[PDB]
Design an enzyme around this catalytic site. Structure first.
Site, PDB file in Angstrom:
ATOM      1  N   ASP A   1      18.802  -1.485  23.971  1.00 27.42           N
ATOM      2  CA  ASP A   1      18.795  -0.518  25.057  1.00 27.42           C
ATOM      3  C   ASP A   1      19.818   0.582  24.803  1.00 27.42           C
ATOM      4  O   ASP A   1      21.004   0.409  25.070  1.00 27.42           O
ATOM      5  CB  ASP A   1      19.127  -1.249  26.350  1.00 27.42           C
ATOM      6  CG  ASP A   1      19.135  -0.341  27.542  1.00 27.42           C
ATOM      7  OD1 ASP A   1      18.679   0.808  27.416  1.00 27.42           O
ATOM      8  OD2 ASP A   1      19.572  -0.796  28.626  1.00 27.42           O
TER       9      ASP A   1
ATOM     10  N   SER B   1      16.300  18.920  25.196  1.00 25.94           N
ATOM     11  CA  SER B   1      15.052  19.330  24.602  1.00 25.94           C
ATOM     12  C   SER B   1      14.842  20.819  24.831  1.00 25.94           C
ATOM     13  O   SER B   1      15.263  21.371  25.844  1.00 25.94           O
ATOM     14  CB  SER B   1      13.904  18.518  25.202  1.00 25.94           C
ATOM     15  OG  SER B   1      12.648  18.995  24.775  1.00 25.94           O
TER      16      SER B   1
HETATM   17  N1  LIG Z   1      16.506   0.239  31.450  1.00 29.63           N
HETATM   18  C1  LIG Z   1      17.253  -0.982  31.293  1.00 29.63           C
HETATM   19  C2  LIG Z   1      16.393  -2.184  31.501  1.00 29.63           C
HETATM   20  C3  LIG Z   1      15.883  -2.923  30.450  1.00 29.63           C
HETATM   21  C4  LIG Z   1      15.097  -4.033  30.681  1.00 29.63           C
HETATM   22  C5  LIG Z   1      14.831  -4.381  31.999  1.00 29.63           C
HETATM   23  C6  LIG Z   1      14.036  -5.567  32.282  1.00 29.63           C
HETATM   24  C7  LIG Z   1      13.474  -6.491  31.470  1.00 29.63           C
HETATM   25  C8  LIG Z   1      12.811  -7.423  32.321  1.00 29.63           C
HETATM   26  C9  LIG Z   1      13.008  -7.016  33.572  1.00 29.63           C
HETATM   27  O1  LIG Z   1      13.760  -5.869  33.590  1.00 29.63           O
HETATM   28  N2  LIG Z   1      15.304  -3.682  33.043  1.00 29.63           N
HETATM   29  C10 LIG Z   1      16.068  -2.612  32.776  1.00 29.63           C
END
Ligand SMILES: NCc1ccc(-c2ccco2)nc1
Length: 330
Positions: free
Chosen positions: A35, A199
């Site tokens: 991430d 961008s």
């Molecule tokens: N933008 C960060 C992020 C990454 C993965 C998730 C995620 C995976 C399963 C459920 O929620 N949520 C937020």
């Protein structure tokens, strides 16, 4: 040193990508969501509330001879999608694709929100934004990349996400066989802790390019492309029957549509997102209304070049003293 690991979509929609990560001694392999929009390496663990674990692989620090409790340290994170997790912290050996960091902070979840529990395919996150966003308290911890940086052949990592297919995260080198043409580099602001860049504009389908500055973040941990409402309206106006649905929570379109491409500018270069990349399928099983992959950022406070955009490119996260981003077609 270098590392190279394959990253694999979690489902048929490319909702997220998982990359195997070795933690501890002997290795415990967990599939983490890399991430570039956050800065915590956290995992489902033997400490996670049992009712909040449903199919994930867990890290068990007591089985790792190199794990050490980081005394007094806790962490707690909330993400833009409303999900969250929290817990305590170990240091341990972490390897990605053959690149090893000793003493990496591994944030062990005691609690995770329902969306994490409900996704059996993601065993945790590996943050690759700037360490200034790391949530460990009282002593903030470094990301895997920051810890590895000095040892890398070059202080970079690259994201090469696949469309409906596996891709690659490389650390420490740029695979010149992985892209076409040249890589165009563009300035980054680290002021908000993100890989934030501007961008130079966009085009919809075969339409003329609109030169306009769009400030946003390169975020591998966000599925979709979130852009200003003006841009998003211009895109969906080219799709018969597309509309913004407050009940669904964004633009939807008839599943029978063939979507136009979307081009974004990187300096004088152009990255083309094929229309098919923008189809996120039926809003609910069996529906003929499909969810769009380009959505408004209006309620977010930042534009987000998520996976929909990034997977159309080979992306260099250059962690030199003055960081930059590079984009190439592929
Ligand atoms: N933008 C960060 C992020 C990454 C993965 C998730 C995620 C995976 C399963 C459920 O929620 N949520 C937020």
């Amino acid at each position: 040193s270098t590392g190279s690991a394959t990253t694999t979509p979690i489902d048929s929609l490319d909702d997220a990508y998982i990359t195997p990560v070795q933690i501890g001694t002997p290795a415990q392999t967990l599939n983490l969501d890399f991430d570039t929009g956050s800065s915590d390496l956290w995992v489902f663990s033997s400490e996670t509330t049992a009712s909040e674990v449903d199919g994930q692989t867990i890290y068990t620090p007591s089985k790792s001879t190199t794990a050490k409790l980081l005394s007094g340290a806790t962490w707690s994170i909330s993400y833009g999608d409303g999900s969250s997790s929290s817990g305590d912290v170990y240091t341990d050996t972490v390897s990605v694709g053959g690149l090893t960091v000793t003493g990496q902070a591994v944030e062990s979840a005691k609690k995770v929100s329902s969306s994490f529990t409900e996704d059996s395919t993601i065993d945790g996150l590996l943050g690759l934004a700037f360490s200034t966003l790391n949530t460990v308290s009282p002593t903030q911890q470094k990301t895997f990349f920051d810890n590895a940086k000095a040892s890398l052949d070059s202080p970079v990592f690259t994201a090469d996400l696949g469309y409906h297919a596996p891709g690659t995260y490389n650390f420490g080198f740029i695979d010149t066989t992985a892209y076409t043409g040249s890589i165009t580099y563009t300035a980054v602001s680290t002021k908000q802790g993100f890989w934030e860049w501007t961008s130079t504009g966009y085009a919809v389908g075969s339409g003329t390019f609109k030169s306009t500055s769009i400030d946003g973040i390169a975020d591998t941990g966000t599925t979709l492309l979130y852009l200003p409402a003006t841009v998003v309206s211009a895109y969906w106006a080219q799709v018969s029957g597309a509309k913004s649905s407050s009940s669904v929570g964004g633009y939807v379109f008839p599943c029978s549509a063939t979507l136009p491409s979307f081009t974004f500018g990187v300096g004088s270069a152009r990255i083309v997102i094929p229309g098919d990349y923008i189809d996120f399928g039926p809003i609910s099983t069996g529906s003929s209304s499909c969810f769009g992959g380009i959505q408004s950022s209006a309620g977010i406070g930042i534009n987000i070049f998520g996976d929909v955009a990034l997977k159309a490119a080979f992306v260099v996260f250059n962690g030199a003293t003055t960081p930059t981003l590079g984009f190439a077609s592929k």
